């Protein structure tokens, strides 16, 4: 024999885990995040864009709209830790967002229903934006840091 067989062989069965005392409780957002607030994206394909926050989803994500007709940002999800909440707020009453949920953004060219629902949501938002001067132009521009800007001193 090349090697003597072990006298004792360990067990081959897998023990079950102990009961875990970790109950999931709903996330609470920071006070600055209110529906209708203008948000500044900090990362991703649309980094620097200014979008409108609409609804909080079940998966701790935020539903946002550009609107797509203004800056080209469609209805998407963003992480709450990757946005900056400004003080500018747009009225959100009159916008139907109950249809959008986690399964609506399921992964599984462009889907026909997504385009149609984009125009329905944007129609109400754009009407509200027109009542504030320079608001449409503000959402079209992109945010950036200039020389001498101190983020710890800037007020949004």
């Amino acid at each position: 024999s090349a090697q003597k067989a072990p006298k004792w062989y360990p067990s081959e069965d897998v023990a079950a885990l102990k009961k875990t005392r970790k109950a999931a409780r709903p996330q609470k957002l920071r006070a600055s995040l209110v529906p209708g607030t203008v948000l500044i994206l900090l990362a991703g394909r649309f980094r620097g864009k200014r979008v409108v926050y609409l609804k909080h989803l079940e998966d701790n994500t935020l539903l946002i709209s550009g609107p797509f007709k203004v800056n080209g940002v469609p209805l998407r999800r963003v992480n709450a830790r990757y946005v900056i909440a400004t003080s500018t707020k747009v009225s959100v009453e009159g916008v139907n967002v109950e249809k959008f949920n986690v399964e609506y953004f399921a992964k599984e060219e462009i889907k026909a229903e997504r385009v149609e629902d984009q125009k329905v949501v944007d129609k109400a938002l754009i009407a509200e934006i027109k009542k504030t001067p320079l608001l449409k132009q503000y959402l079209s521009a992109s945010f950036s840091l200039k020389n001498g800007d101190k983020p710890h001193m800037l007020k949004f």
Partner: protein
């Protein structure tokens, strides 16, 4: 394809080389404890090589485990291989260095039938 285990941690991956084994050819790298009265290695002065000690011992739950999670067992023939028939999730067979080319074919065929992992299946392969 082995039993679940905690992450394997190595406290000291670097080899312990004998002092001044890189200075003279007559001094091998096999570890030897310096016992000189004035030796800076024995006295543990800052900036010198580290010495092996029991504090580096690995966790007993992952000791002797290969990165795949199996323990190595040396096998010379089919009968030795069949010892691991009911221990396929903890032991892997390794063919001895002095096994002929024709006898390795029989062992590899038997090991695949029993589901026993082989760590060196390409040895003496006439491909």
């Amino acid at each position: 394809a082995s039993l679940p285990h905690p992450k394997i941690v190595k406290k000291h991956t670097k080899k312990f080389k004998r002092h001044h084994s890189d200075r003279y050819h007559r001094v091998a790298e096999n570890w030897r404890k310096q016992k000189g009265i004035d030796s800076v290695v024995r006295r543990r002065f800052r900036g010198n090589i580290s010495q092996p000690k029991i504090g580096y011992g690995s966790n007993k739950k992952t000791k002797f485990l290969s990165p795949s999670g199996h323990k190595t067992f040396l096998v010379a023939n089919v009968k030795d291989l069949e010892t691991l028939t009911m221990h396929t999730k903890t032991y892997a067979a390794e063919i001895a260095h002095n096994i002929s080319a024709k006898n390795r074919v029989v062992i590899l065929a038997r090991a695949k039938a029993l589901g026993i992992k082989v760590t060196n299946p390409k040895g003496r392969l006439a491909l």
